[PDB]
Amino acid sequence: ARGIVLEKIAVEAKQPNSGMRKAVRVQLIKNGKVVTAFCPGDGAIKFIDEHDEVIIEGIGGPKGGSMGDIPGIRYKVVKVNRVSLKELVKGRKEKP
Amino acid sequence: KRQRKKYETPPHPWIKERLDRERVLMDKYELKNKKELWKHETQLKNFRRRARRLLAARGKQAEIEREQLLARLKRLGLLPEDAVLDDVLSLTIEDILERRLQTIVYKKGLARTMRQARQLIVHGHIEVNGQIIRSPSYLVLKEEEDTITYARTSPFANPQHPERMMIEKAKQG
Amino acid sequence: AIWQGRSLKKPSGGRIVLARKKRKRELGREPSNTRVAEQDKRKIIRTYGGNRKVRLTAAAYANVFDKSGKGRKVRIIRVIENPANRQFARRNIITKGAIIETEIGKAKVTSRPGQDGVVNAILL
Amino acid sequence: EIRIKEIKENKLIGRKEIYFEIYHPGEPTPSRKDVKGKLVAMLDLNPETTVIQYIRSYFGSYISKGYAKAYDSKERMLYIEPEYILIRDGLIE
Amino acid sequence: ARKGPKRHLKRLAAPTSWYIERKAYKWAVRPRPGPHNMRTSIPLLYIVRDYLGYAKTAREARKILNEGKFLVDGRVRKDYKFPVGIMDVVSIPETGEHYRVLPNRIGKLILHPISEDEAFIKPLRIRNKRMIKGARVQLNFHDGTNHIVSIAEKDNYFTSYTVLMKVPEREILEVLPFEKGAYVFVTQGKNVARKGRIVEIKRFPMGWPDVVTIEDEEGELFDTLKEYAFVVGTDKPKISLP
RNA sequence: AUUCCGGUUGAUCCUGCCGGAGGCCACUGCUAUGGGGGUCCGACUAAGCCAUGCGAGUCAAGGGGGCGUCCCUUCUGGGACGCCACCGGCGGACGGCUCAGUAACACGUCGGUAACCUACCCUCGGGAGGGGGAUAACCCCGGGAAACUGGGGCUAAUCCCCCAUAGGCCUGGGGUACUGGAAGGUCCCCAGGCCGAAAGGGAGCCGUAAGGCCCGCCCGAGGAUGCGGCGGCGGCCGAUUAGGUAGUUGGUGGGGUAACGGCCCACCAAGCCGAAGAUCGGUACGGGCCGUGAGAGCGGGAGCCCGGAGAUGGACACUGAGACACGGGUCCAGGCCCUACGGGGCGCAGCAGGCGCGAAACCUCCGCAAUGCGGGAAACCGCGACGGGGGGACCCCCAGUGCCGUGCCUCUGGCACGGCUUUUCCGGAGUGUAAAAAGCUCCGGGAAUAAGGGCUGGGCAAGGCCGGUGGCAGCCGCCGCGGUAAUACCGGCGGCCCGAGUGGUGGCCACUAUUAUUGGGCCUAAAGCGGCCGUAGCCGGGCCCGUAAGUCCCUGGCGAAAUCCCACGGCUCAACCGUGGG
């Protein structure tokens, strides 16, 4: 789904796992609900900024639910402004 | 309506036993893809499927289909002329691997190496029954086994092509 | 329109939703309402498949028949009794099975003016 | 060379129908003019009335299939045989 | 939605009695209404193109039919949609060639060649009898043709009898009757392209026709329906039957 | 092809749940997908909204014309050809497009019309007379911006109209033959009434001519094509929807219909459905089928074919054989384009392109041929049907990116030396356009000339060392790793797996005996109600006689094709196609 991001939020891994996970909150262009998507990778949040077009899918948790050490987050971004996240994580391409 | 793949993927891609066995096999025959081995195993398995359905089958159609099966197996050069249904289960993958066109041409001495036979087949330097075939995965019938011959226009047809010297020395050597 | 089609209710009672529009092959036509007059006025009607059918809107004469089988063309004075409806006899309406009074006397109509275009009856 | 597999006779159309094979080992598929002018010899046929429809060049084969007509009069071919193949054979500009 | 009479027929839906390749193209010749049913006939165009190979392209075939070089039942027909059905005689005088249309053992139609002398006789099953004004008797055949005869000659015919019809001039030659022991060639069913003799006629009420039992040459007994039974001789077939 | 394994514990065994391991369908990253052959692409949301182009025409053999050309002869002129347009013969009720409704005799099967219709088509018997009348086109003038639209002159037929008779209809009476198991119908006679046919023809041969040959007309009786209506059975969820239905259910007598019937209407009655779940709601075109599974089964109806339904929503007519008619008409609702404001036109859920929508689907392409349809006696003509051709990491089949001798090492392979083929590409030659293209098939020039994705602690077992990161950064489907030495995070190297594909996500079957009839549990893990009675339902002792409803064996019709299994033949093989058997 395609969404527009509003705010950057960092959360604490559930114990005993400790770690500051970066994620964003997005309003869906389709209907307008508000949902958080996790950003995987290293230095991902640096690319993303306020008011950014994004594309988002499900996290692939058990029954689609949460994964591992992050709580309830059901989604991850794949493309930001029609540019795929992973290569920007690799840095091969450039964000617009 | 969609056409199905002709091969069956292994139920698990990382069993050490099966992986190394397949490795030994494709080492022996120098195939390009495990897909090829899988296809050959597939037609082996379907031969056996027919055999097993028929061995318990009763009825005139069953007998006729059984005779058709036996006849085609014989015609492929995979069985003796006195073969009986009971033995067809004992057919191994290697029985079909030998019957591969590429293995036959290498076994005719016309190639020093399996891959050289492949290069000839793709490059068309071989002819069968007066018609050229470019596919090293084709399965050869018994009746054609004597007609496997150099393609006429092929430079290898002449007895002076320098590679053919090395081919002959490998044959006799 | 005049639509001679499915009852909107099931035999049990569940109301039936329609799923398609009506069809011209399925509609009917107006009632003739044949009446007593001084002259015969008739309308021919083109019908399904190009057929024809003539329709008496006013009737003046009738073909009465004796039990022997001999027919008399005669006039029609008035209708005695209409078993189909009570309003019809009051309004000189002519329909099959009606009891009619002619110069000869009492006759029973054995023909439908609506479809036949003529009125035949049996002297009683 | 040319070897005839079949010659049959459409009497309702007054024409000969010829199936043949062309041997061309190692040499390109022949042009229409040569095959016509060379087939015209060994059945004693008029060039104008004769038309060749298709010469199929087989993959990986030195034998090409060939199939051709032979009519008996000028008018019949114009009446029946459609203009395109006449243009291919040159019988019509 | 559809709104009345068709004018097309896709190849895939064609009847199973036609030796026509089905996935080569999509459109076929819809037969116009005619003597024989869809299930027991084929357009003449396919006869010209496939079964005789005289025409490769339908346009050329139609041209040859326009020339009127073809004699079906002693009548030229230009309609390239003519249903040429069962037990018809196709005659080409330009070639002096004569075939009869007959089904297969599988349930498909073939042109069995016949002698020229036989080409003028056509046996017709008597489908039904009727009285027309003037007290005249009109007989409707299996192929849909009709023959008128006198009241006195009414008992000469009964339904399910075979009349050897002289198609060139429409003259009645002989009437093979339906009685025990006749020679009968089957028309439809699993017993298609069978020829045998009759032992019994099964009188079936409740909507089910007469099941005749046929005894083959080798003596094997089987059953088929009345309407599928077509008599061709009292004890031997009067026509060449494969 | 009937396969597991990891995670509850200081340690073990159960329970059950979850996670990996496979196929199928949609979206997407990276990478290319070079070569070919079969197969698909608004495929679920907006059946929401459009500029544009096209798609449905053909008739000179009905007829009269007018325009122009030819030729002849010409005071009179005929024929031939083309254009125009005319009533007129036909068609635009097929085919193309889609799945909202619809839970239904819409539909699958079998019957089912004796209660229907039917133009073009076929067969058989008969008939084709007389008479009259009309107005287009063309010429004289006209309006309005238009759309569109006036009057006068004369003109044609197979046009229209009246009559001739048959013939159509309905009834009474009286009979007899055909059909058929059946009923009654049809056949004939008599009697009563209304309605109530035609068409000739362009040319040529013989005949002075008529006439015959060819085409065309009409009545009647059949057939055939297509369609109308009746029926048993089959095929969803909900009870936190339990009572329901008034032309409701049946009877009498009629009406209208192509036709039977509550389809309607007047009267007479009190029915009919529902716990082997009506009613109501939710949901949804039905089938051939397809994905998965060892199979029992589970799930789904997008792509082709068959049937059903629709043309923004509703509603109503005319023409007609066939219609309520995507490319015909009228109003209302709705939003849009033109306009002297008077007037006008509306529908790309037809094909090619657009707007919107959204994660999410192609060219404003060419020929009328191949096959088919309408036309016409024929030639032949139109078709966004079709055919091909285009973009696309749809489905499936094949195939390549070098081979060989040789020294050293990386001795798995690589490196260099020698020799060898030309994968792809370029020029010519055959299809090929039914005009290109298709780039296929062979020749000649000749190149070593295109390979990436994921992973490397374990479940999956398989793929290990170095540098940096230090409970931050981050990884991770589950365990879990990381607080300074990390084989588990990131870079490199090394390695493994697959392969022109691989990876991530989503949904479906197996995994799953975690849906259990095959084949599950209920003392301690969640699961037996506190006990008893009993209606329907389900399951029920043995022996003798009968039956054949079930059950079983044989036998005819039928369950259409395409898809599926098998042998054979063609395409180089394959896929695909054909023939034959299931």
Side-chain angles (χ1 to χ4, degrees), chain B residues 137-161:
Chain B
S137 57
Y138 164 65
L139 86 172
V140 187
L141 316 184
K142 191 170 175 181
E143 57 183 333
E144 309 143 322
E145 206 162 3
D146 58 340
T147 73
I148 318 301
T149 52
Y150 276 29
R152 189 131 293 104
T153 279
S154 76
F156 293 81
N158 60 77
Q160 267 53 56
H161 200 68

PDB file of all heavy atoms in Angstrom, chain B residues 137-161:
ATOM      1  N   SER B 137      19.757 -33.114 -24.860  1.00  0.00           N
ATOM      2  CA  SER B 137      18.868 -33.786 -23.926  1.00  0.00           C
ATOM      3  C   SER B 137      17.900 -34.739 -24.611  1.00  0.00           C
ATOM      4  O   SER B 137      17.070 -35.347 -23.928  1.00  0.00           O
ATOM      5  CB  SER B 137      18.089 -32.752 -23.112  1.00  0.00           C
ATOM      6  OG  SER B 137      17.363 -31.872 -23.952  1.00  0.00           O
ATOM      7  N   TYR B 138      17.979 -34.890 -25.927  1.00  0.00           N
ATOM      8  CA  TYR B 138      17.051 -35.766 -26.624  1.00  0.00           C
ATOM      9  C   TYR B 138      17.365 -37.228 -26.329  1.00  0.00           C
ATOM     10  O   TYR B 138      18.530 -37.626 -26.251  1.00  0.00           O
ATOM     11  CB  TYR B 138      17.110 -35.502 -28.124  1.00  0.00           C
ATOM     12  CG  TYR B 138      16.495 -36.599 -28.952  1.00  0.00           C
ATOM     13  CD1 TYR B 138      15.137 -36.870 -28.878  1.00  0.00           C
ATOM     14  CD2 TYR B 138      17.267 -37.362 -29.811  1.00  0.00           C
ATOM     15  CE1 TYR B 138      14.568 -37.869 -29.638  1.00  0.00           C
ATOM     16  CE2 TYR B 138      16.708 -38.364 -30.570  1.00  0.00           C
ATOM     17  CZ  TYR B 138      15.359 -38.612 -30.481  1.00  0.00           C
ATOM     18  OH  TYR B 138      14.801 -39.615 -31.235  1.00  0.00           O
ATOM     19  N   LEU B 139      16.315 -38.028 -26.166  1.00  0.00           N
ATOM     20  CA  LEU B 139      16.436 -39.452 -25.880  1.00  0.00           C
ATOM     21  C   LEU B 139      16.341 -40.245 -27.175  1.00  0.00           C
ATOM     22  O   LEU B 139      15.393 -40.074 -27.943  1.00  0.00           O
ATOM     23  CB  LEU B 139      15.350 -39.894 -24.898  1.00  0.00           C
ATOM     24  CG  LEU B 139      13.963 -40.293 -25.418  1.00  0.00           C
ATOM     25  CD1 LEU B 139      13.150 -40.872 -24.288  1.00  0.00           C
ATOM     26  CD2 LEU B 139      13.228 -39.106 -26.031  1.00  0.00           C
ATOM     27  N   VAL B 140      17.302 -41.134 -27.399  1.00  0.00           N
ATOM     28  CA  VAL B 140      17.465 -41.805 -28.685  1.00  0.00           C
ATOM     29  C   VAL B 140      16.806 -43.177 -28.630  1.00  0.00           C
ATOM     30  O   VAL B 140      16.960 -43.911 -27.646  1.00  0.00           O
ATOM     31  CB  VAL B 140      18.952 -41.928 -29.055  1.00  0.00           C
ATOM     32  CG1 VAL B 140      19.095 -42.471 -30.460  1.00  0.00           C
ATOM     33  CG2 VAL B 140      19.655 -40.580 -28.916  1.00  0.00           C
ATOM     34  N   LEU B 141      16.066 -43.523 -29.680  1.00  0.00           N
ATOM     35  CA  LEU B 141      15.516 -44.864 -29.785  1.00  0.00           C
ATOM     36  C   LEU B 141      16.615 -45.861 -30.119  1.00  0.00           C
ATOM     37  O   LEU B 141      17.702 -45.500 -30.572  1.00  0.00           O
ATOM     38  CB  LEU B 141      14.440 -44.945 -30.864  1.00  0.00           C
ATOM     39  CG  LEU B 141      13.400 -43.834 -30.927  1.00  0.00           C
ATOM     40  CD1 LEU B 141      12.382 -44.159 -31.998  1.00  0.00           C
ATOM     41  CD2 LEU B 141      12.731 -43.652 -29.584  1.00  0.00           C
ATOM     42  N   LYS B 142      16.320 -47.139 -29.892  1.00  0.00           N
ATOM     43  CA  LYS B 142      17.288 -48.173 -30.238  1.00  0.00           C
ATOM     44  C   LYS B 142      17.524 -48.225 -31.740  1.00  0.00           C
ATOM     45  O   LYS B 142      18.671 -48.326 -32.191  1.00  0.00           O
ATOM     46  CB  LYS B 142      16.809 -49.527 -29.736  1.00  0.00           C
ATOM     47  CG  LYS B 142      17.870 -50.594 -29.831  1.00  0.00           C
ATOM     48  CD  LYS B 142      17.449 -51.846 -29.106  1.00  0.00           C
ATOM     49  CE  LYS B 142      18.462 -52.954 -29.299  1.00  0.00           C
ATOM     50  NZ  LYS B 142      18.047 -54.196 -28.600  1.00  0.00           N
ATOM     51  N   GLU B 143      16.450 -48.145 -32.527  1.00  0.00           N
ATOM     52  CA  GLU B 143      16.556 -48.332 -33.969  1.00  0.00           C
ATOM     53  C   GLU B 143      17.461 -47.295 -34.619  1.00  0.00           C
ATOM     54  O   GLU B 143      18.087 -47.583 -35.645  1.00  0.00           O
ATOM     55  CB  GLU B 143      15.168 -48.279 -34.601  1.00  0.00           C
ATOM     56  CG  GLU B 143      14.400 -46.999 -34.319  1.00  0.00           C
ATOM     57  CD  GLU B 143      13.002 -47.025 -34.894  1.00  0.00           C
ATOM     58  OE1 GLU B 143      12.785 -47.737 -35.896  1.00  0.00           O
ATOM     59  OE2 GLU B 143      12.120 -46.336 -34.340  1.00  0.00           O
ATOM     60  N   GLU B 144      17.541 -46.094 -34.055  1.00  0.00           N
ATOM     61  CA  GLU B 144      18.383 -45.044 -34.615  1.00  0.00           C
ATOM     62  C   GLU B 144      19.840 -45.158 -34.185  1.00  0.00           C
ATOM     63  O   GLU B 144      20.681 -44.425 -34.717  1.00  0.00           O
ATOM     64  CB  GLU B 144      17.873 -43.664 -34.193  1.00  0.00           C
ATOM     65  CG  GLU B 144      16.391 -43.387 -34.436  1.00  0.00           C
ATOM     66  CD  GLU B 144      15.755 -42.561 -33.325  1.00  0.00           C
ATOM     67  OE1 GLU B 144      16.090 -42.771 -32.135  1.00  0.00           O
ATOM     68  OE2 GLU B 144      14.920 -41.689 -33.645  1.00  0.00           O
ATOM     69  N   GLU B 145      20.150 -46.041 -33.233  1.00  0.00           N
ATOM     70  CA  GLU B 145      21.472 -46.034 -32.618  1.00  0.00           C
ATOM     71  C   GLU B 145      22.572 -46.293 -33.638  1.00  0.00           C
ATOM     72  O   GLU B 145      23.707 -45.840 -33.455  1.00  0.00           O
ATOM     73  CB  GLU B 145      21.525 -47.075 -31.498  1.00  0.00           C
ATOM     74  CG  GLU B 145      22.550 -46.771 -30.407  1.00  0.00           C
ATOM     75  CD  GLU B 145      22.304 -47.547 -29.124  1.00  0.00           C
ATOM     76  OE1 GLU B 145      21.370 -48.376 -29.091  1.00  0.00           O
ATOM     77  OE2 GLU B 145      23.041 -47.322 -28.141  1.00  0.00           O
ATOM     78  N   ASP B 146      22.262 -47.015 -34.712  1.00  0.00           N
ATOM     79  CA  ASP B 146      23.258 -47.305 -35.733  1.00  0.00           C
ATOM     80  C   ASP B 146      23.442 -46.168 -36.729  1.00  0.00           C
ATOM     81  O   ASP B 146      24.465 -46.132 -37.419  1.00  0.00           O
ATOM     82  CB  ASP B 146      22.878 -48.584 -36.485  1.00  0.00           C
ATOM     83  CG  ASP B 146      21.511 -48.498 -37.128  1.00  0.00           C
ATOM     84  OD1 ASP B 146      20.716 -47.636 -36.701  1.00  0.00           O
ATOM     85  OD2 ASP B 146      21.232 -49.286 -38.056  1.00  0.00           O
ATOM     86  N   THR B 147      22.500 -45.233 -36.810  1.00  0.00           N
ATOM     87  CA  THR B 147      22.533 -44.180 -37.812  1.00  0.00           C
ATOM     88  C   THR B 147      23.183 -42.902 -37.308  1.00  0.00           C
ATOM     89  O   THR B 147      23.205 -41.905 -38.036  1.00  0.00           O
ATOM     90  CB  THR B 147      21.118 -43.873 -38.284  1.00  0.00           C
ATOM     91  OG1 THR B 147      20.418 -43.167 -37.254  1.00  0.00           O
ATOM     92  CG2 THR B 147      20.382 -45.152 -38.595  1.00  0.00           C
ATOM     93  N   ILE B 148      23.720 -42.903 -36.092  1.00  0.00           N
ATOM     94  CA  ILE B 148      24.231 -41.670 -35.505  1.00  0.00           C
ATOM     95  C   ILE B 148      25.537 -41.332 -36.204  1.00  0.00           C
ATOM     96  O   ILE B 148      26.534 -42.045 -36.058  1.00  0.00           O
ATOM     97  CB  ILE B 148      24.424 -41.789 -33.982  1.00  0.00           C
ATOM     98  CG1 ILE B 148      23.252 -42.538 -33.327  1.00  0.00           C
ATOM     99  CG2 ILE B 148      24.619 -40.411 -33.367  1.00  0.00           C
ATOM    100  CD1 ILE B 148      21.901 -41.900 -33.527  1.00  0.00           C
ATOM    101  N   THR B 149      25.540 -40.243 -36.970  1.00  0.00           N
ATOM    102  CA  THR B 149      26.599 -39.967 -37.924  1.00  0.00           C
ATOM    103  C   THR B 149      26.866 -38.472 -38.027  1.00  0.00           C
ATOM    104  O   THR B 149      26.030 -37.641 -37.675  1.00  0.00           O
ATOM    105  CB  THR B 149      26.236 -40.515 -39.305  1.00  0.00           C
ATOM    106  OG1 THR B 149      24.939 -40.034 -39.677  1.00  0.00           O
ATOM    107  CG2 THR B 149      26.236 -42.034 -39.301  1.00  0.00           C
ATOM    108  N   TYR B 150      28.048 -38.146 -38.538  1.00  0.00           N
ATOM    109  CA  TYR B 150      28.442 -36.754 -38.703  1.00  0.00           C
ATOM    110  C   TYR B 150      27.551 -36.055 -39.719  1.00  0.00           C
ATOM    111  O   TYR B 150      27.225 -36.610 -40.771  1.00  0.00           O
ATOM    112  CB  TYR B 150      29.894 -36.671 -39.163  1.00  0.00           C
ATOM    113  CG  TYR B 150      30.911 -36.744 -38.053  1.00  0.00           C
ATOM    114  CD1 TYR B 150      30.653 -37.441 -36.882  1.00  0.00           C
ATOM    115  CD2 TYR B 150      32.137 -36.119 -38.181  1.00  0.00           C
ATOM    116  CE1 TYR B 150      31.587 -37.504 -35.874  1.00  0.00           C
ATOM    117  CE2 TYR B 150      33.076 -36.177 -37.183  1.00  0.00           C
ATOM    118  CZ  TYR B 150      32.797 -36.869 -36.030  1.00  0.00           C
ATOM    119  OH  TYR B 150      33.736 -36.928 -35.027  1.00  0.00           O
ATOM    120  N   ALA B 151      27.166 -34.821 -39.407  1.00  0.00           N
ATOM    121  CA  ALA B 151      26.380 -34.037 -40.346  1.00  0.00           C
ATOM    122  C   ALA B 151      27.218 -33.696 -41.568  1.00  0.00           C
ATOM    123  O   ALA B 151      28.381 -33.305 -41.454  1.00  0.00           O
ATOM    124  CB  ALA B 151      25.864 -32.766 -39.681  1.00  0.00           C
ATOM    125  N   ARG B 152      26.605 -33.837 -42.742  1.00  0.00           N
ATOM    126  CA  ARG B 152      27.357 -33.807 -43.992  1.00  0.00           C
ATOM    127  C   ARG B 152      28.067 -32.475 -44.188  1.00  0.00           C
ATOM    128  O   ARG B 152      29.284 -32.432 -44.403  1.00  0.00           O
ATOM    129  CB  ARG B 152      26.412 -34.080 -45.155  1.00  0.00           C
ATOM    130  CG  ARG B 152      27.108 -34.286 -46.475  1.00  0.00           C
ATOM    131  CD  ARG B 152      26.603 -35.534 -47.169  1.00  0.00           C
ATOM    132  NE  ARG B 152      26.977 -36.748 -46.445  1.00  0.00           N
ATOM    133  CZ  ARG B 152      26.172 -37.487 -45.689  1.00  0.00           C
ATOM    134  NH1 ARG B 152      24.898 -37.178 -45.509  1.00  0.00           N
ATOM    135  NH2 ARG B 152      26.663 -38.568 -45.091  1.00  0.00           N
ATOM    136  N   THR B 153      27.325 -31.375 -44.098  1.00  0.00           N
ATOM    137  CA  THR B 153      27.916 -30.059 -44.293  1.00  0.00           C
ATOM    138  C   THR B 153      28.913 -29.719 -43.191  1.00  0.00           C
ATOM    139  O   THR B 153      29.743 -28.824 -43.377  1.00  0.00           O
ATOM    140  CB  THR B 153      26.791 -29.015 -44.381  1.00  0.00           C
ATOM    141  OG1 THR B 153      26.250 -29.013 -45.708  1.00  0.00           O
ATOM    142  CG2 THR B 153      27.272 -27.599 -44.063  1.00  0.00           C
ATOM    143  N   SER B 154      28.869 -30.432 -42.067  1.00  0.00           N
ATOM    144  CA  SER B 154      29.730 -30.102 -40.944  1.00  0.00           C
ATOM    145  C   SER B 154      31.195 -30.213 -41.359  1.00  0.00           C
ATOM    146  O   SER B 154      31.573 -31.181 -42.029  1.00  0.00           O
ATOM    147  CB  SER B 154      29.469 -31.041 -39.768  1.00  0.00           C
ATOM    148  OG  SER B 154      30.059 -32.309 -39.996  1.00  0.00           O
ATOM    149  N   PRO B 155      32.048 -29.257 -40.978  1.00  0.00           N
ATOM    150  CA  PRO B 155      33.475 -29.416 -41.285  1.00  0.00           C
ATOM    151  C   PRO B 155      34.073 -30.654 -40.657  1.00  0.00           C
ATOM    152  O   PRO B 155      35.098 -31.144 -41.142  1.00  0.00           O
ATOM    153  CB  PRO B 155      34.108 -28.138 -40.716  1.00  0.00           C
ATOM    154  CG  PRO B 155      32.995 -27.174 -40.582  1.00  0.00           C
ATOM    155  CD  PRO B 155      31.791 -27.989 -40.271  1.00  0.00           C
ATOM    156  N   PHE B 156      33.470 -31.174 -39.591  1.00  0.00           N
ATOM    157  CA  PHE B 156      33.967 -32.389 -38.966  1.00  0.00           C
ATOM    158  C   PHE B 156      33.676 -33.629 -39.800  1.00  0.00           C
ATOM    159  O   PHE B 156      34.318 -34.663 -39.587  1.00  0.00           O
ATOM    160  CB  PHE B 156      33.355 -32.531 -37.573  1.00  0.00           C
ATOM    161  CG  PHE B 156      33.814 -31.478 -36.604  1.00  0.00           C
ATOM    162  CD1 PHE B 156      33.233 -30.219 -36.601  1.00  0.00           C
ATOM    163  CD2 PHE B 156      34.819 -31.745 -35.694  1.00  0.00           C
ATOM    164  CE1 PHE B 156      33.651 -29.247 -35.713  1.00  0.00           C
ATOM    165  CE2 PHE B 156      35.239 -30.778 -34.800  1.00  0.00           C
ATOM    166  CZ  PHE B 156      34.655 -29.527 -34.811  1.00  0.00           C
ATOM    167  N   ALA B 157      32.740 -33.543 -40.751  1.00  0.00           N
ATOM    168  CA  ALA B 157      32.436 -34.694 -41.597  1.00  0.00           C
ATOM    169  C   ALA B 157      33.655 -35.133 -42.390  1.00  0.00           C
ATOM    170  O   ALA B 157      33.914 -36.334 -42.527  1.00  0.00           O
ATOM    171  CB  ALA B 157      31.285 -34.363 -42.544  1.00  0.00           C
ATOM    172  N   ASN B 158      34.414 -34.183 -42.924  1.00  0.00           N
ATOM    173  CA  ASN B 158      35.604 -34.544 -43.669  1.00  0.00           C
ATOM    174  C   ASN B 158      36.607 -35.210 -42.726  1.00  0.00           C
ATOM    175  O   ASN B 158      36.650 -34.877 -41.537  1.00  0.00           O
ATOM    176  CB  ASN B 158      36.241 -33.319 -44.320  1.00  0.00           C
ATOM    177  CG  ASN B 158      36.647 -32.270 -43.309  1.00  0.00           C
ATOM    178  OD1 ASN B 158      37.667 -32.405 -42.632  1.00  0.00           O
ATOM    179  ND2 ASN B 158      35.851 -31.213 -43.200  1.00  0.00           N
ATOM    180  N   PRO B 159      37.433 -36.149 -43.216  1.00  0.00           N
ATOM    181  CA  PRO B 159      38.400 -36.798 -42.320  1.00  0.00           C
ATOM    182  C   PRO B 159      39.669 -35.991 -42.096  1.00  0.00           C
ATOM    183  O   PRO B 159      40.692 -36.569 -41.719  1.00  0.00           O
ATOM    184  CB  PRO B 159      38.721 -38.116 -43.039  1.00  0.00           C
ATOM    185  CG  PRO B 159      37.749 -38.211 -44.166  1.00  0.00           C
ATOM    186  CD  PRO B 159      37.431 -36.812 -44.530  1.00  0.00           C
ATOM    187  N   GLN B 160      39.641 -34.687 -42.382  1.00  0.00           N
ATOM    188  CA  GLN B 160      40.819 -33.832 -42.270  1.00  0.00           C
ATOM    189  C   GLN B 160      40.655 -32.700 -41.259  1.00  0.00           C
ATOM    190  O   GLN B 160      41.589 -31.907 -41.084  1.00  0.00           O
ATOM    191  CB  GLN B 160      41.167 -33.253 -43.646  1.00  0.00           C
ATOM    192  CG  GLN B 160      42.176 -34.080 -44.426  1.00  0.00           C
ATOM    193  CD  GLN B 160      41.763 -35.535 -44.539  1.00  0.00           C
ATOM    194  OE1 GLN B 160      40.675 -35.848 -45.021  1.00  0.00           O
ATOM    195  NE2 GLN B 160      42.630 -36.433 -44.088  1.00  0.00           N
ATOM    196  N   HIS B 161      39.514 -32.596 -40.585  1.00  0.00           N
ATOM    197  CA  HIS B 161      39.316 -31.491 -39.650  1.00  0.00           C
ATOM    198  C   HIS B 161      40.218 -31.668 -38.431  1.00  0.00           C
ATOM    199  O   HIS B 161      40.060 -32.657 -37.705  1.00  0.00           O
ATOM    200  CB  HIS B 161      37.860 -31.410 -39.204  1.00  0.00           C
ATOM    201  CG  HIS B 161      37.472 -30.070 -38.653  1.00  0.00           C
ATOM    202  ND1 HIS B 161      37.408 -28.933 -39.427  1.00  0.00           N
ATOM    203  CD2 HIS B 161      37.152 -29.686 -37.394  1.00  0.00           C
ATOM    204  CE1 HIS B 161      37.051 -27.908 -38.673  1.00  0.00           C
ATOM    205  NE2 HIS B 161      36.891 -28.338 -37.434  1.00  0.00           N
TER     206      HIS B 161
END
